[PDB]
Amino acid sequence: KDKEFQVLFVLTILTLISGTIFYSTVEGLRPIDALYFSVVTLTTVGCDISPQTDFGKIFTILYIFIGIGLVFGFIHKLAVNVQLPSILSNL
């Protein structure tokens, strides 16, 4: 497998783990909700809640700038790998 894809995967996972830890401890979310919030924030889908604490709001601002580029780089490389078998079967 492509090292470039593997590194993007690792960076993404590490970034989502850090968010899950932060929001589950600081904002009192269940782990699955902390992970969900991290994911929909960094992919810009968003959701129906926001952090309650000032610490949480500051973290989220920085989290977005730290992570959005990484996540969308991963989504793009993932898309190439997911769609390529179908392209190659059709070509």
Secondary structure class of 53 (helix, strand, coil): coil
Name the token pair of 15. Answer: 């970034």
Q: ∠ CA(19), CA(64), CA(42), 5° rounding?
A: 70
Is residue 31 at the binding interface for Cl ion, with CB under 5 A as the rule? yes
DSSP state of 50: -
Q: How far is the CB of 14 from K ion (least distance, A)?
A: 23
> By CB under 5 A, which span of 10-18, 30-38, 55-63, 82-90 interacts with Cl ion?
30-38
Other CB atoms closer than 10 Å to residue 21's CB: what's the count?
14
Is residue 57 at the binding interface for Cl ion, with CB under 5 A as the rule? no
Is residue 44 at the binding interface for K ion, with CB under 5 A as the rule? yes
Is residue 13 at the binding interface for Cl ion, with CB under 5 A as the rule? no
Instruction: Point out which residues bind Cl ion (CB under 5 A).
Output: 30-32
